[PDB]
Design a protein around this nucleic acid. Structure first.
Ligand code: CA
Ligand code: CA
Ligand code: CA
Ligand code: CA
Length: 136
RNA sequence: UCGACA
DNA sequence: ATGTCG
């Protein structure tokens, strides 16, 4: 379809997978960075993509914005839709932080409401999502 | 056996 | 390579 420029685009950035994970949200039109998560020692790409969308949901809700959120992650979009992050990253002391954030994100989703449309960013047609990290 | 999204 | 879904 056509790009809805009046929106929020989110993405994960990592060093290894599993590895160090962070994420950010930007204004789709300008690329202005609206939020960024402090790096988490160990996590997966999908967990990060998931946390980015949920944070985007909370970010927009707090500001009473009805703008949609763009994510290029089929997995993260589904996890948010199901309000359940089906990650199989092992749960141990080293992954405790990322899992805490994931569990808290799920917790938020199951105790709050929103109608924010979560749209699939069509990378194969529009290029890389505006919140992207690293080379293509 | 892949196909796809990262 | 690894994380996930269809
Ligand atoms: Ca992405
Ligand atoms: Ca988070
Ligand atoms: Ca949803
Ligand atoms: Ca990237």
């Amino acid at each position: 379809e056509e790009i809805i420029w009046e929106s929020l685009s989110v993405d994960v950035g990592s060093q290894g997978n599993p590895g160090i994970v962070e994420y950010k949200g930007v204004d789709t039109k300008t690329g202005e960075v609206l939020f960024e998560r402090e790096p988490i020692p160990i996590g997966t790409n999908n967990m990060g993509e998931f946390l980015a969308i949920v944070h985007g949901l909370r970010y927009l809700k707090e500001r009473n914005s009805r703008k949609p959120i763009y994510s290029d992650s089929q997995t993260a979009i589904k996890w948010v839709k199901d309000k359940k992050a089906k990650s199989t990253l092992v749960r141990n002391e080293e992954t405790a932080l990322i899992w805490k954030l994931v569990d808290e994100a799920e917790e938020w989703l199951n105790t709050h409401t929103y109608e924010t449309p979560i749209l699939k960013w069509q990378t194969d047609k529009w290029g890389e999502i505006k919140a992207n990290y690293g080379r293509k």
